[PDB]
Every structure is written in C-alpha cells, then in structure tokens.
C-alpha cells in the first residue's frame, strides 16, 4: 500500500509504503469492506472501498474543488457558492485529500440548485447493470 | 432497558432510518439502499411497510451499492369502487384545444347536460365537418 | 435590582401570605439540582441503553 | 375638563408617528402612551378616579 | 407493577389465573399495612371549624 | 422540463417596528422616572 | 392486461404472476377500463421481480 | 400522543408520509413527490429533515410530476 | 419469594444478575413498614410532639 | 386450593378471567370471618410487660 498522511496546517504530507500479509484492516472489521460495481473496465477505477475510524465525508482538493463522499462509495461534486452550501449544510471547513486516490471512486452529477429544478414523467433506464445475488 | 433493549434488530427486512427517512433493504448479511418502496418489496418478496430504526444501529451493518427500478411508485393502497367511469374531454380556446382525462364519476350540475334528444354539435377534422348526435359522429 | 431591593425592603410591610411564598422558593430551587445534574452527566441515557 | 381633553391629541400624535400603512405597529405605541398618560395624570391630580 | 411488566416483555407470560393470584393477594397486603399506620385515631381542628 | 418556482415575498419593513419598540421603551422610561423621583 | 395508475398520473405495468401479485399486495380483483381512455397516460417501466434484482453504481441522466 | 403517534401539516416545506415514508416537497400550494432528500433540500433552500405527516392529510392537497436529481 | 421462584422454575431467568434489584429493594421496603413505622392508639407519643 | 387444583388436572381449565372471579372473591370471605373471630382487644397483658 501507498500511504498519504497529513495534519491540518502542515506544509507537506507524508508519503510512505506499507506491506504485509493482508490489507491493513483489523480482522474484526474485515467483513464490512464494500465491493463496487465497476462499470469502467479500464484500470482507472477501484474494486473495493473501506471506511475506517475517523474518516472524512466532506473533502477539498487542490482553484480548489469540493466533493462529497457517500457511505456507498460514490462521490458527488458541490458548488462553491453560498446558496449551494447554505441549502445542503456543509458550512464547516472540509478536510484535505489527494486527487490520486479520490479520483478512483465512481462519480455522480454535481449538486447545483440550477439543475435540481426539473420535472419528469419517467426517468431513463440504466444500461449495463449488475446482478444482485441473494 | 428490559422492556426494549438495544439488541432487538432484524424485526423485518424493510427498514427506514428513523432520523433521515432513508430506505434500506436487507439481503444476506448486508444492507442495500433502495430507490423506492416498490422495488424494496419486489426484492424482498414481502408486502410490508418500512420499520423505523435508530440511525446509530444501521451504521454498524455493511453497505452495498444502490438497488431497484428508478422512478417506480412509492406508495400502494388498492381501491375497488362499485362502478368504473372514464371520460375523455376536449375544450376549445378563443385555434387551440386542451385534452383532459377524467377518472371517476362526473359532475353534471350547472348548465352541463347530456346530449340527448335532438341536440347536436358540429366540429372540424381533416377539413371535413362532423355532426355529433346519438353518441356517434 | 439588588441595590433597589436592599434599600426598600427594610422599611415596608408584607402580609403573611407573601412571606410564606418567598420561603418556599428556596425549596423549589433545591429540589431540581440532583435530577438535572445526573441528566447533564448523561446517566439516564447511559442506563437506558446500558 | 381641559387636562382630560389634552390627552387625545398627544395620543394620536404618537400613534401616527410610524411610517407606512396603518396597522399593528401604530397600535403598540398609541395605546401605550394613552396608558401612561392616564396613570400619570391620576396620581398627581387625585380626582376623577372612575 | 415494574416487576410484573418486566416478566411479560421477556415472554414468560406465567401470569393469568394460577400465577396472577400471587400479585393479586400480595397487592392487598401493602394497602393494609399502610392503612394501619394512618388509622391511629379520629379528631379534628380543620380550617372550616377554626 | 424546468420547474416553475413562485416569486418570493418581500421582507416586512423594520423601520416601523423599531420606532414602535422605541416608543414603548421611551414612554415607560419617561413615565417611570416621574413616578420614582416623586417618592423622594 | 393489468396496470397500476399513480396519483401523479403515470401508469405502470404489472406482470401477471403469482409472485409479483403477492409481493406487491395486488391479490385482489382489478376494475375494467377502456383502451381509448387509458392509452393517454404516460407509461413507466414494468414492475416485476426479475427487473428489480439489479445493482447500480450511479444513475444516468440522458 | 405517545400511544399512537401521528403528525400534522405546518410551515415546514419538507414532509413525509407517516406510514409509507414517501417524500414530498411543497411549492406554492402544490405538493411534488421528490426523488430524494438531497434534491428536496436544494429545491426548498432549507437544510432540514422531513416532517412526518398523517397519510389522510397528504391525500387532500394537489400534486405534480416527480422532481429532483436521480441517484443523489 | 414464591413469585421469583415460580419465574425461575418457569425458566425466564430475567431476575438473574442486576435484574434482581427490583425484588431486592421491594423486600427491603416491606421490611421497613412492618418493623418500624409508627405507633398505634396506645402509643400517642411521637417525635413531633415530644 | 385442592378443589381448584383437581379441576385443572382433569383438563376442563374453566378458570381464568370469568371463572377465577368466584374463587378469588370467595377466598376473601373466609379471611373476613376469621378476622371477626379474633375480635375485641385492648387487654394489653404480655410477658415483656409483666
């Protein structure tokens, strides 16, 4: 594993490498890793996602861009404007994260008030889905 | 504490976050977020309704991606009336029309009337003129 | 308000029904301290979820 | 009679002072000054108690 | 009542008929014991008489 | 299709409310002063 | 054929099978309607047990 | 109120059905079914949670087509 | 004691451990009323009058 | 109690609710007759007094 670590306000993050017999999660928590659908067959997307203790939901990246990550492992972009912030909440300051990791999660549409104001009779169907096995 | 302890989970397979109102479905040992109640029922196989559960409990069970049919109906309440009634209506502006569908019994009060007897009306379609009477054109 | 009360109270007459009322305010103030402190210490929530 | 008569012009003058359409805010200070004027006139005049 | 209710939530449901006779008989004893202490005498100096 | 939102209502004027609040504040302070001093 | 009409005006089809009927709670007798009147409401996706057993990362917006 | 909880319509604009959990959002004098909480907050402009309302009450107000962002 | 024994023979095992605090405090409360309490008609003396 | 128990072993199980009210109320009558039997009092002789 490549590891990136940073404390708020520090001038630079620490980059390290770890290795071992198993992914760095306790055996008691090993059963709650999420397995993504992965519609993109190219090497540009992850297979699994895990949220450990003291994780971060609201994140900012290097002009800056704001992103919101769901427990299901999907990421959504948020407008920088006062309206979008005040309407969702998200007034607190976001934590920092590296683009080389954050880009590996699947992306949804941005949460802009300008495009939520629409009506529909029926919605489009989703191509290339995956089987839910019981 | 003895009348209702914390460990009494898994009472039904369709649960809703008591705080956020979000809807989840249980399959195997994981919880999957469902798009709507119609698809939650079909996946589970039970004609039940969501059971409200405290948000602190659902955070302890493994997740899964979204499941269901997008845009399906969100509530069911079958009804059976004594008689079935439908109307298709045309109303003309004063070069322009609108079409209305009515389901249920109509309101015949006021100047509204059935077109019985010698009553008639004349309208245009494709250049031709059509006379309406005896329920035919 | 304290100086105002201190200056006027010693030279006025108050009927028994009011003097008996100020006495009971002390007891009404003492009673809620323990039920409230344990609430602030989260004891009732801690026990209900054991 | 003269004192009692002077309270009305003073009262409407205070009620009319706020800007905009007439409504709730005019009534608040209108009836307020009327209350103080009568209460004040009563103690120092000591007459027409009813 | 708390002791009785706690058993039902556990599902033992041992009460009804044969079982209920214990709490039913036991309940009368408490009322008799507290009644006996208050029933020490009868004389009055009540506000309506004073 | 785009949703048709209604035009938001205008906020009520604060100026009449502040002078009205100033009226009671002033009147009660004025009336109270003549009552208190007269006790001396 | 059997259909479901929502309060919002759209109509959805129901597959006539014992499992679909019982899962949704439609083990009841349906009322009749003519095609000339019913065809005018917009049609949504079909309701069936097989169609719902699918997973999605995120939904598209054509 | 503790034996059989319920609810009633108030000033809040985000509401949900007391027995079915469906989400609705008010726009003027009309209720629109919303696809999710995120778009309901964003349409109304208030960061809040849905208010549970009696199902016999929701049935009396007029409706409109579905609104919001799918999958949010 | 019979109620608790009946529940234990029935197999509920709800009163095991801390759950026992309900029977225990009741048994103590009953003990206070029967042995101490207050005097009868032949025992008119009491702390408030002595 | 013997009369009541013998009916359960036969399986008729007619008691509970409607039926139990007879033996329940009948049981009070016996205690009420023994209470009148111990009637009188105020003699107040006792080994500890002698």
XYZ file of C-alpha atoms in Angstrom:
695
model
C 0.000 0.000 0.000
C 0.934 3.614 -0.714
C 0.035 5.850 2.250
C -0.599 9.614 2.390
C -0.884 11.342 5.788
C -1.456 14.981 6.730
C -2.376 17.159 9.710
C -4.324 20.394 9.252
C -2.000 23.322 8.521
C 1.187 21.318 7.923
C 3.265 22.428 4.946
C 3.602 18.925 3.466
C 2.000 15.495 3.653
C 3.981 12.357 4.474
C 4.229 9.657 1.793
C 5.065 6.101 2.897
C 4.831 2.473 1.758
C 3.413 -0.449 3.772
C 3.407 -4.179 3.083
C 2.127 -7.302 4.804
C 0.083 -10.497 4.524
C -3.300 -8.718 4.415
C -4.820 -5.308 3.741
C -4.360 -3.014 6.781
C -7.778 -3.529 8.378
C -8.494 -5.431 11.575
C -9.831 -8.962 11.151
C -12.907 -7.938 13.165
C -13.733 -5.261 10.549
C -12.656 -7.322 7.514
C -16.265 -8.356 6.802
C -17.568 -4.805 6.109
C -15.498 -3.836 3.034
C -17.763 -2.587 0.200
C -17.490 -4.219 -3.253
C -18.119 -1.736 -6.106
C -19.982 -2.469 -9.360
C -17.146 -1.146 -11.596
C -18.737 -0.422 -14.982
C -15.401 1.004 -16.246
C -13.272 -1.962 -17.350
C -10.159 0.212 -17.704
C -7.608 0.323 -14.891
C -8.853 3.746 -13.786
C -11.262 2.626 -11.030
C -11.070 0.718 -7.750
C -12.585 -2.678 -6.952
C -13.315 -2.121 -3.246
C -13.652 0.699 -0.723
C -13.244 0.707 3.065
C -14.038 3.484 5.559
C -12.014 3.178 8.748
C -12.319 5.069 12.021
C -12.329 8.876 11.900
C -12.911 9.072 8.145
C -13.924 12.244 6.251
C -17.119 12.864 4.245
C -16.683 16.476 3.035
C -13.354 16.960 1.251
C -11.445 19.604 -0.724
C -8.646 19.159 -3.274
C -6.051 21.393 -4.897
C -8.981 26.946 -7.883
C -9.978 24.335 -5.301
C -12.788 21.823 -5.853
C -15.264 20.470 -3.268
C -16.501 16.846 -3.159
C -18.958 14.813 -1.018
C -18.397 11.056 -0.487
C -21.279 8.701 0.436
C -21.097 5.547 2.534
C -21.895 3.571 -0.649
C -18.543 4.698 -2.067
C -19.794 7.211 -4.652
C -18.595 10.834 -4.915
C -20.618 13.957 -5.816
C -19.390 17.482 -6.631
C -20.695 20.501 -4.664
C -20.923 24.102 -5.902
C -18.666 26.629 -4.138
C -21.466 29.234 -3.822
C -23.255 30.362 -0.661
C -26.620 29.119 -1.961
C -25.477 25.536 -2.515
C -23.606 25.435 0.806
C -26.354 27.063 2.902
C -29.005 24.809 1.331
C -27.249 21.490 1.984
C -25.497 22.472 5.238
C -21.794 21.833 4.759
C -20.775 25.163 6.332
C -17.844 23.599 8.242
C -14.357 23.551 6.683
C -13.545 20.436 4.610
C -10.617 18.094 5.173
C -7.851 17.729 2.567
C -7.394 14.671 0.324
C -5.120 13.660 -2.596
C -6.506 13.552 -6.124
C -4.614 10.329 -6.997
C -6.819 8.434 -4.509
C -10.096 10.377 -4.640
C -10.324 10.011 -8.445
C -10.589 6.203 -8.083
C -14.210 6.390 -6.741
C -17.204 6.477 -9.161
C -18.695 9.911 -9.905
C -22.280 11.222 -9.815
C -23.773 14.544 -11.000
C -22.909 17.812 -9.222
C -25.356 19.197 -6.625
C -26.218 22.557 -8.260
C -29.522 24.293 -7.484
C -29.695 25.362 -11.150
C -30.277 21.739 -12.271
C -32.387 20.309 -9.425
C -35.366 22.435 -10.592
C -36.660 19.944 -13.202
C -39.772 17.771 -13.682
C -40.207 14.323 -15.234
C -42.924 11.823 -16.095
C -40.492 8.888 -16.303
C -36.730 8.523 -15.932
C -34.161 6.964 -18.305
C -33.181 3.335 -17.729
C -29.623 2.410 -16.675
C -27.562 0.428 -19.196
C -25.039 -2.234 -18.103
C -26.239 -3.008 -14.549
C -25.012 -5.839 -12.289
C -26.808 -8.791 -10.695
C -27.967 -8.724 -7.070
C -27.342 -12.265 -5.772
C -29.213 -13.453 -2.683
C -33.953 -1.236 29.471
C -35.580 -4.667 29.993
C -38.823 -3.821 28.168
C -36.953 -2.743 24.998
C -33.198 -3.406 24.773
C -30.769 -2.340 22.041
C -30.080 -5.828 20.584
C -33.590 -6.416 19.147
C -32.693 -5.785 15.486
C -33.812 -7.740 12.371
C -37.546 -7.481 13.079
C -38.367 -7.090 9.338
C -36.400 -6.842 6.073
C -37.576 -3.333 5.082
C -36.217 -0.672 7.445
C -36.014 3.110 7.331
C -33.592 5.442 9.077
C -35.687 6.962 11.861
C -33.834 10.294 11.557
C -33.007 10.680 7.834
C -36.078 8.891 6.435
C -33.803 6.886 4.113
C -34.950 3.426 2.975
C -32.818 0.252 3.212
C -33.303 -3.434 2.362
C -31.591 -6.456 3.953
C -30.176 -9.277 1.812
C -27.951 -11.952 3.280
C -25.953 -10.087 5.931
C -25.619 -6.638 4.225
C -27.915 -3.604 3.927
C -28.519 -2.074 0.479
C -30.080 1.393 -0.046
C -33.219 1.072 -2.187
C -34.524 3.639 -4.658
C -38.190 3.239 -3.639
C -40.727 1.092 -1.791
C -41.977 -0.714 -4.916
C -38.532 -2.152 -5.667
C -37.889 -2.892 -1.984
C -40.986 -5.101 -1.882
C -40.149 -6.974 -5.090
C -36.569 -7.711 -3.949
C -37.696 -8.948 -0.517
C -40.922 -10.693 -1.502
C -42.993 -9.383 1.416
C -45.919 -6.914 1.104
C -44.714 -4.991 4.181
C -44.045 -1.295 5.026
C -40.834 0.280 6.370
C -39.984 -0.169 10.048
C -38.267 2.868 11.612
C -34.830 2.088 13.114
C -32.396 4.313 15.021
C -29.596 5.659 12.781
C -26.866 4.544 15.220
C -27.770 0.894 14.553
C -27.724 0.953 10.705
C -24.136 2.336 10.760
C -22.910 -0.977 12.259
C -24.036 -3.153 9.281
C -22.157 -3.480 5.957
C -23.295 -1.436 2.939
C -23.877 -2.156 -0.751
C -24.481 -0.193 -3.974
C -27.926 1.176 -4.986
C -30.679 -1.306 -5.947
C -34.109 -1.286 -7.640
C -36.006 0.295 -10.537
C -35.562 4.077 -10.920
C -38.770 6.144 -10.743
C -41.165 3.341 -9.714
C -44.192 4.108 -7.486
C -43.549 4.955 -3.825
C -46.871 4.019 -2.178
C -49.588 1.365 -2.521
C -53.235 1.407 -1.405
C -55.553 -0.671 -3.630
C -59.121 0.575 -4.056
C -62.171 -1.021 -5.684
C -65.214 1.128 -6.490
C -68.760 -0.080 -7.198
C -68.631 1.076 -10.849
C -65.905 2.115 -13.291
C -66.186 5.521 -15.004
C -63.911 7.267 -17.535
C -64.204 10.456 -19.646
C -62.086 11.979 -22.426
C -62.700 15.732 -22.815
C -61.918 18.425 -25.400
C -62.092 22.160 -24.591
C -61.566 24.821 -27.279
C -59.981 28.272 -26.785
C -60.974 31.717 -28.104
C -57.174 27.906 -32.776
C -56.274 25.861 -29.672
C -57.531 22.915 -27.586
C -56.649 21.008 -24.447
C -57.319 17.339 -23.673
C -58.335 16.155 -20.194
C -58.776 12.611 -18.857
C -61.272 12.166 -16.007
C -61.367 9.050 -13.830
C -64.402 8.778 -11.551
C -67.975 9.993 -11.574
C -68.589 13.272 -13.440
C -70.341 16.350 -12.037
C -73.383 17.127 -14.252
C -74.595 20.160 -12.235
C -74.978 23.637 -13.710
C -75.558 24.130 -17.420
C -73.842 20.829 -18.199
C -76.194 18.344 -19.810
C -76.322 15.039 -21.628
C -76.602 15.461 -25.399
C -79.919 13.575 -25.586
C -82.822 14.052 -27.994
C -82.370 16.357 -30.988
C -79.291 18.076 -29.509
C -76.167 18.171 -31.673
C -72.800 19.887 -32.168
C -70.566 20.377 -35.242
C -66.738 20.253 -35.383
C -63.899 20.076 -37.947
C -61.209 17.417 -38.503
C -59.000 16.994 -41.559
C -61.117 19.559 -43.408
C -64.312 17.519 -43.118
C -67.165 18.546 -40.817
C -68.709 16.023 -38.398
C -72.134 16.157 -36.710
C -72.377 14.586 -33.246
C -75.670 13.016 -32.105
C -76.986 9.661 -30.827
C -73.499 9.163 -29.417
C -71.843 8.831 -32.841
C -70.012 11.127 -35.282
C -32.189 45.483 41.106
C -30.214 44.238 44.113
C -29.500 47.735 45.427
C -33.116 48.735 44.755
C -34.426 45.776 46.799
C -31.873 46.305 49.603
C -32.945 49.955 50.078
C -36.757 49.453 50.018
C -37.323 46.081 51.749
C -36.297 47.098 55.305
C -38.956 49.859 55.603
C -42.104 48.149 54.208
C -44.816 45.768 55.443
C -45.578 42.436 53.738
C -48.510 40.172 54.544
C -48.026 36.592 55.824
C -49.142 35.073 52.505
C -46.189 36.693 50.689
C -43.554 35.987 53.379
C -44.622 32.323 53.271
C -44.245 32.424 49.469
C -40.593 33.600 49.473
C -39.678 30.817 51.934
C -40.911 28.105 49.545
C -38.763 29.476 46.685
C -35.633 28.107 48.384
C -37.045 24.545 48.497
C -38.336 24.766 44.920
C -34.792 25.744 43.876
C -33.047 22.953 45.854
C -35.192 20.092 44.501
C -34.216 20.193 40.754
C -30.383 20.186 41.283
C -29.888 16.383 41.546
C -32.424 15.364 38.846
C -30.727 17.897 36.490
C -27.060 17.163 37.342
C -27.480 13.446 36.529
C -29.124 14.482 33.238
C -26.121 16.684 32.435
C -23.859 13.714 33.298
C -25.891 11.641 30.733
C -26.691 8.929 33.350
C -30.325 8.396 32.251
C -29.283 7.843 28.624
C -26.330 5.647 29.649
C -28.545 3.321 31.720
C -31.416 3.158 29.217
C -29.013 1.854 26.561
C -26.969 0.008 29.221
C -62.038 69.020 31.558
C -59.039 70.774 29.952
C -56.448 68.226 31.192
C -58.603 65.252 30.152
C -59.054 66.851 26.684
C -55.274 67.381 26.139
C -54.506 63.595 26.226
C -56.215 62.838 22.864
C -54.008 64.997 20.555
C -50.839 63.744 22.312
C -52.098 60.146 21.922
C -52.897 60.245 18.174
C -49.644 62.147 17.518
C -47.656 59.200 18.938
C -49.807 56.590 17.157
C -49.348 58.312 13.758
C -45.553 58.677 14.000
C -44.512 55.301 12.451
C -44.198 55.280 8.646
C -46.014 53.133 6.109
C -49.551 51.775 6.013
C -51.575 51.900 9.207
C -51.755 48.656 11.176
C -50.250 46.738 14.101
C -47.166 48.909 14.871
C -49.308 52.056 15.257
C -51.483 50.422 17.952
C -48.490 49.338 20.093
C -47.285 52.872 20.985
C -50.692 54.566 20.528
C -52.340 52.591 23.369
C -49.028 52.598 25.269
C -48.808 56.397 25.712
C -52.564 56.543 26.438
C -51.992 54.087 29.313
C -49.096 56.112 30.810
C -50.836 59.487 30.386
C -53.955 58.413 32.329
C -51.956 56.554 35.011
C -49.662 59.568 35.393
C -52.489 62.158 35.455
C -54.416 60.116 38.055
C -51.713 60.088 40.769
C -50.781 63.773 40.540
C -54.364 65.024 40.094
C -56.052 62.718 42.638
C -59.524 63.225 41.189
C -61.973 61.668 38.704
C -60.810 58.204 39.869
C -63.621 56.404 37.996
C -46.004 -3.273 38.590
C -42.485 -2.887 37.205
C -41.546 -6.367 38.452
C -44.706 -7.799 36.806
C -44.284 -5.939 33.477
C -40.605 -6.937 33.097
C -41.638 -10.634 33.038
C -44.151 -10.116 30.184
C -41.590 -8.337 27.982
C -39.372 -11.420 28.407
C -42.272 -13.556 27.086
C -42.612 -15.967 30.011
C -46.289 -14.910 30.466
C -46.515 -17.125 33.578
C -49.345 -14.910 34.951
C -53.076 -15.345 34.440
C -55.183 -17.472 36.760
C -52.801 -19.605 38.881
C -49.945 -17.090 38.586
C -51.901 -13.816 38.917
C -53.179 -14.983 42.334
C -49.754 -14.182 43.884
C -49.513 -10.471 42.872
C -53.272 -10.109 43.437
C -53.064 -11.339 47.051
C -49.704 -9.592 47.646
C -51.163 -6.228 46.494
C -53.824 -6.201 49.261
C -51.165 -6.646 51.970
C -49.401 -3.363 51.124
C -52.635 -1.329 51.331
C -53.497 -2.895 54.710
C -50.027 -2.209 56.192
C -50.007 1.495 55.218
C -53.687 1.951 56.166
C -52.980 0.558 59.676
C -50.386 3.280 60.369
C -52.673 6.191 59.399
C -55.777 4.758 61.180
C -54.448 5.661 64.653
C -57.315 7.984 65.679
C -60.106 10.421 64.798
C -60.427 14.059 65.976
C -60.455 17.350 64.020
C -59.331 21.020 64.233
C -59.903 21.779 60.499
C -59.881 25.207 58.805
C -63.696 25.056 58.266
C -64.112 24.717 62.071
C -61.381 27.203 63.085
C -38.679 20.141 -18.246
C -37.840 23.099 -15.947
C -39.813 23.701 -12.730
C -41.757 26.994 -12.302
C -40.949 28.396 -8.832
C -43.120 31.190 -7.338
C -41.696 34.684 -6.772
C -40.574 35.062 -3.098
C -42.407 37.547 -0.845
C -40.714 40.822 0.162
C -39.493 41.126 3.790
C -41.544 43.401 6.070
C -40.146 46.884 6.803
C -38.141 47.013 10.047
C -38.329 50.834 10.423
C -41.960 50.992 11.693
C -41.289 48.155 14.153
C -38.111 49.760 15.583
C -39.768 53.166 16.179
C -42.798 51.430 17.746
C -40.468 49.431 20.021
C -38.635 52.709 20.711
C -41.997 54.260 21.607
C -42.754 51.822 24.440
C -39.119 51.873 25.562
C -39.229 55.679 25.725
C -42.728 56.057 27.229
C -42.192 53.530 30.048
C -38.788 55.051 30.916
C -40.311 58.570 30.893
C -43.366 57.597 32.975
C -41.342 55.514 35.432
C -38.881 58.364 36.090
C -41.547 60.869 37.244
C -43.102 58.190 39.492
C -39.816 57.183 41.159
C -38.405 60.683 41.768
C -41.691 61.869 43.283
C -41.251 59.338 46.106
C -38.379 61.493 47.426
C -53.706 -6.945 -19.117
C -53.131 -5.411 -15.676
C -51.910 -1.853 -14.950
C -51.309 0.450 -11.946
C -52.199 4.189 -12.124
C -50.386 6.572 -9.735
C -51.680 9.733 -8.097
C -49.157 11.714 -10.195
C -50.764 10.430 -13.428
C -48.311 7.837 -14.817
C -49.281 4.191 -15.486
C -47.055 1.157 -14.747
C -47.465 -2.437 -15.973
C -47.733 -5.449 -13.628
C -46.594 -8.922 -14.722
C -49.464 -11.365 -14.125
C -47.622 -13.918 -11.985
C -48.410 -15.250 -8.507
C -45.073 -13.990 -7.097
C -45.365 -10.419 -8.431
C -49.008 -10.059 -7.388
C -48.315 -11.301 -3.840
C -45.087 -9.348 -3.370
C -46.762 -6.037 -4.254
C -50.028 -6.855 -2.427
C -52.296 -6.980 -5.502
C -54.060 -10.280 -4.731
C -57.383 -8.598 -5.415
C -59.699 -8.286 -8.449
C -58.974 -5.390 -10.842
C -61.528 -2.938 -12.264
C -62.136 -2.635 -16.020
C -61.010 0.276 -18.226
C -61.154 1.004 -21.992
C -58.004 1.384 -24.080
C -59.108 4.698 -25.717
C -59.095 6.448 -22.342
C -56.201 4.616 -20.683
C -53.723 4.972 -23.573
C -53.466 8.730 -22.895
C -51.467 8.469 -19.619
C -47.624 8.256 -19.820
C -46.110 4.779 -19.432
C -43.307 3.948 -16.993
C -41.126 0.853 -16.566
C -42.611 -2.581 -15.891
C -42.944 -3.933 -12.324
C -41.574 -7.471 -11.961
C -39.390 -9.377 -9.502
C -36.629 -10.030 -12.063
C -36.389 -6.360 -13.127
C -35.679 -5.192 -9.554
C -32.846 -7.627 -8.685
C -30.133 -5.337 -10.096
C -27.360 -3.111 -8.679
C -26.271 0.331 -9.877
C -23.258 2.492 -9.101
C -24.957 5.726 -10.181
C -27.864 6.555 -12.451
C -27.519 8.343 -15.799
C -29.437 11.402 -16.991
C -29.979 11.349 -20.763
C -49.922 11.359 21.533
C -47.496 8.705 22.900
C -49.793 5.692 22.413
C -50.329 6.205 18.648
C -48.053 8.913 17.236
C -49.083 10.935 14.179
C -48.437 14.387 12.688
C -49.952 17.453 11.064
C -49.036 19.931 8.325
C -47.130 23.016 9.441
C -44.950 25.757 7.950
C -42.063 23.357 7.197
C -41.766 22.614 3.446
C -40.255 19.074 3.533
C -42.753 16.396 4.597
C -43.040 12.604 4.543
C -45.929 10.143 4.815
C -46.356 8.800 8.367
C -46.964 5.198 7.215
C -45.334 4.890 3.767
C -42.184 7.040 4.104
C -42.681 8.733 0.720
C -41.029 12.164 0.350
C -42.975 15.212 -0.833
C -41.960 18.866 -1.212
C -44.300 21.876 -1.343
C -44.047 24.589 -3.992
C -46.704 27.176 -3.663
C -49.946 25.416 -2.829
C -48.994 22.139 -4.525
C -47.084 19.028 -3.371
C -44.479 17.408 -5.635
C -43.073 13.916 -4.954
C -39.289 14.266 -4.604
C -36.777 11.596 -5.582
C -34.503 12.136 -2.561
C -33.605 14.318 0.415
C -30.630 15.994 -1.288
C -32.742 17.465 -4.082
C -35.527 18.328 -1.620
C -33.137 20.463 0.441
C -31.669 22.046 -2.673
C -35.097 22.876 -4.170
C -36.507 24.472 -0.998
C -33.280 26.023 0.296
C -33.626 24.890 3.920
C -31.112 22.437 5.430
C -33.532 20.234 7.370
C -35.083 16.751 7.847
C -38.526 15.545 6.709
C -41.566 16.090 8.938
C -43.835 13.029 9.264
C -47.455 13.775 8.284
C -50.694 11.795 8.523
C -51.404 9.997 5.232
C -55.099 11.041 5.216
C -53.936 14.680 5.233
C -51.450 14.430 2.339
C -54.187 12.981 0.105
C -56.193 16.245 0.224
C -53.575 18.576 -1.365
C -52.927 18.827 -5.149
C -49.973 17.053 -6.816
C -47.403 17.402 -9.609
C -44.868 15.256 -11.532
C -41.640 13.923 -9.992
C -38.797 16.378 -9.262
C -35.084 16.357 -8.355
C -31.779 14.681 -9.301
C -31.931 10.889 -9.754
C -29.490 8.852 -7.638
C -28.308 11.715 -5.395
C -40.261 -15.170 47.197
C -42.795 -17.531 45.619
C -43.266 -15.236 42.606
C -39.498 -15.156 41.960
C -39.241 -18.948 42.470
C -42.191 -19.521 40.101
C -40.461 -17.405 37.410
C -37.145 -19.253 37.940
C -38.826 -22.665 37.664
C -40.643 -21.435 34.545
C -37.215 -20.635 33.034
C -37.377 -16.897 32.284
C -34.092 -16.161 34.126
C -34.862 -12.419 33.853
C -34.079 -11.727 37.560
C -30.531 -13.046 37.292
C -27.726 -10.589 37.973
C -28.584 -6.871 38.121
C -32.218 -7.622 37.239
C -32.601 -8.796 40.889
C -32.585 -5.140 42.108
C -36.403 -4.988 41.751
C -37.268 -7.869 44.157
C -34.414 -6.839 46.478
C -35.496 -3.199 47.020
C -39.156 -4.235 47.434
C -38.270 -6.840 50.081
C -36.332 -4.110 51.960
C -39.184 -1.584 51.631
C -41.674 -4.075 53.093
C -39.287 -4.732 55.995
C -39.236 -1.017 56.952
C -43.050 -0.707 57.198
C -43.613 -3.864 59.306
C -40.859 -3.464 61.914
C -40.538 0.315 62.353
C -43.336 2.537 61.021
C -45.435 4.257 63.686
C -47.197 3.525 66.968
C -50.882 2.781 67.440
C -53.632 4.180 69.649
C -51.848 3.139 72.857
C -48.640 4.896 71.622
C -49.676 8.555 71.259
C -46.098 9.809 71.814
C -44.044 10.678 68.741
C -41.085 12.820 67.709
C -43.240 15.795 66.566
C -44.950 16.132 69.994
C -42.133 15.061 72.345
C -56.939 -24.918 46.721
C -57.370 -28.686 46.467
C -60.824 -28.228 44.908
C -59.368 -25.752 42.357
C -56.263 -27.840 41.507
C -58.283 -31.050 40.969
C -60.229 -29.347 38.131
C -57.031 -28.415 36.228
C -55.710 -31.996 36.340
C -58.969 -33.037 34.644
C -58.216 -30.521 31.853
C -61.505 -28.602 31.936
C -59.453 -25.426 32.663
C -62.678 -23.426 33.161
C -60.793 -20.905 35.368
C -59.050 -17.729 34.268
C -60.906 -14.438 33.966
C -64.687 -15.068 34.172
C -64.258 -18.286 36.174
C -61.419 -17.215 38.504
C -63.547 -14.357 39.920
C -65.549 -16.871 42.032
C -62.628 -18.491 43.949
C -60.862 -15.109 44.118
C -63.821 -13.358 45.799
C -64.752 -16.485 47.821
C -61.207 -16.551 49.289
C -61.698 -13.059 50.801
C -64.848 -14.135 52.674
C -63.000 -16.783 54.716
C -60.324 -14.315 55.912
C -63.081 -11.821 56.766
C -64.755 -14.418 59.053
C -61.514 -15.275 60.918
C -60.894 -11.537 61.456
C -64.240 -11.234 63.281
C -63.194 -14.354 65.197
C -60.156 -12.631 66.752
C -62.474 -9.709 67.731
C -62.048 -7.379 70.730
C -58.802 -6.191 72.262
C -57.151 -3.544 74.467
C -56.338 -6.113 77.191
C -52.579 -5.423 76.738
C -51.122 -8.107 79.052
C -47.780 -9.535 77.878
C -44.694 -11.413 79.178
C -42.472 -8.355 78.397
C -44.798 -6.083 80.439
C -45.109 -8.448 83.430
